[PDB]
Amino acid sequence: SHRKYEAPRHGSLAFLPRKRAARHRGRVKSFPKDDPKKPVHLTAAMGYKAGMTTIVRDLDRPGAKAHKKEVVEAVTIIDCPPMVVVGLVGYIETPRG
C-alpha cells in the first residue's frame, strides 16, 4: 500500500557512489568552452587551503536590506605560491572523444 505521508528522499542520487575519490588532487572535469576571438589565457590554477578568518565588508547591493551597511562575512584563505610552467599537451578530436 501507499505511503501515508509524503516526504522527499534523503540525499541526492546525483552524488553516487559515496566512495573515496580515486585521486587526492582534484580533477577539472570540464574546462570553459573555447572562443578563438578571445585573447589567450589560462583557465585554472592551484593553491593550498590555509584556513578561515573574518572580514567586515561595506556592502553596495541595491535592493537589499544591508545596502550601504557593514556586513560580517566568513572567508577562506588559499596560499598561492606562483606556479611553474613546464610542459605542453596537444589534443585532437576523434569519434571516440
Binding site: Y5, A7, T54, V56, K65, A66, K69, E70, V71, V72
Partner: protein
C-alpha cells in the same frame, strides 16, 4: 494577505509550537501560547517555529477572560534564544514576548512594556511607533 512579512533575513528560530511567551502589551493578556506560525513550511515531524518579527497564532492562557476563548495573531518582539544579525552580533533577550495584533499589523493594545527587537520594529511600523525602546 497572509501574516508572513516580506524582507526578513534568516535568523535562529527559538519558539516552536507549544511555547508560552509573555504578553508585552496592555491588552489585558498575560501570556501567549503558540499554536501556529505564519509562513511555516511543510516537512515531516518538524515543529513550526518562529523568531523575533514573526507573526504567530496564539491563545491566551492567563489574563482577561474575554481573551481566553479566541485565537489572536501576535508578533514576537523578544526571544531568549541567541541569534545573529548581519553585523556579526549574536544577541538574545532575557525572555520571550510578543504583542497581539490584527492580520493587517495594527496592535490591539496601546502601549508596549519593555524593549522590542530591531527586526520586529523594522517589519511592523505600528510596533515601531508604539515602542519605547528599540533594541
Amino acid at each position: 494577505k497572509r501574516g508572513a512579512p516580506g524582507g526578513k533575513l534568516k535568523m535562529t528560530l527559538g519558539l516552536p509550537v507549544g511555547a508560552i511567551m509573555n504578553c508585552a502589551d496592555n491588552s489585558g493578556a498575560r501570556n501567549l501560547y503558540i499554536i501556529a506560525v505564519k509562513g511555516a513550511g511543510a516537512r515531516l515531524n518538524r515543529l513550526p517555529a518562529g523568531g523575533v518579527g514573526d507573526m504567530v497564532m496564539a491563545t491566551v492562557k492567563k489574563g482577561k477572560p474575554e481573551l481566553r476563548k479566541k485565537v489572536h495573531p501576535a508578533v514576537i518582539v523578544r526571544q531568549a534564544k541567541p541569534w545573529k544579525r548581519f553585523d556579526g552580533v549574536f544577541l538574545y533577550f532575557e525572555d520571550n514576548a510578543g504583542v497581539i495584533v490584527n492580520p493587517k499589523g495594527e496592535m490591539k493594545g496601546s502601549a508596549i512594556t519593555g524593549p522590542v527587537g530591531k527586526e520586529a520594529a523594522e517589519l511592523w511600523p505600528r510596533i515601531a511607533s508604539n515602542a519605547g525602546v528599540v533594541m
